[PDB]
């Protein structure tokens, strides 16, 4: 019960840009973790068809980054509509999390949430309204733990959805292991009794 409710729905998107009024989702990946960040299930990892005219009018940043990663070409070749993609993700979370209870998780995942609330509303209805924003923890680490912040893992930052999810989980695990309070565990308790 409570273990299921404490799962996390990790999502990362690529979009044609940051303009919620015009830009569209072009890539989406999703992983489920337990409350302790262990990966329980890998969800769909999908490249979503969007029109040539939209791709051709992307900002230079998006043209350069989605171009060199291969994403732009893959979007043009995709046969997956937004609606079919949403169904794959919704079916996946229905198999993995109790309705309404689990949050989106990722770096600045409120941006993904803005796009998903608009373009995948039925997927979002399965989730809690709260988020696990790894970048909130990043911003607190930089302020409160500046020495530890220097040791956070370097990111490849490939702007491909599934790879970036994995780096987000690793960043949050780094914070848990380095800036949160230490606790007892099964191994430490046995040592205390032996001593
Ligand atoms: Na992102």
Residue numbers in the entry: 4 to 198
Please quote the authors directly:
Here, we show that Orn exhibits exquisite substrate preference for diribonucleotides. While other cellular RNases process oligoribonucleotides down to diribonucleotide entities, Orn is the one and only diribonucleotidase that completes the terminal step of RNA degradation. From this we propose a general model of RNA degradation, wherein a combination of exoribonucleases process oligoribonucleotides down to diribonucleotides and Orn completes RNA recycling by cleaving diribonucleotides to nucleoside monophosphates.
(A) Crystal structures of REXO2 bound to pApA and pApG. The structural overview (left) shows a C-terminal helix that is unique to Orn orthologs in higher eukaryotes and in the current crystal forms is stabilized by crystal packing contacts. Residue numbering for REXO2 refers to its cytosolic isoform lacking the mitochondria-targeting pre-sequence. Structures of OrnVc (and REXO2) with different diribonucleotides, including di-purine, di-pyrimidine and mixed substrates, revealed identical binding poses. Additional hydrogen bonding between purine residues and Orn in the 3' or 5' position correlates with a small, but detectable preference of OrnVc for purine-containing substrates. Together, the structural analysis uncovered Orn’s mode of substrate binding, which is conserved from bacteria to humans and indicates a unique selection for linear diribonucleotides with a 5’ phosphate.
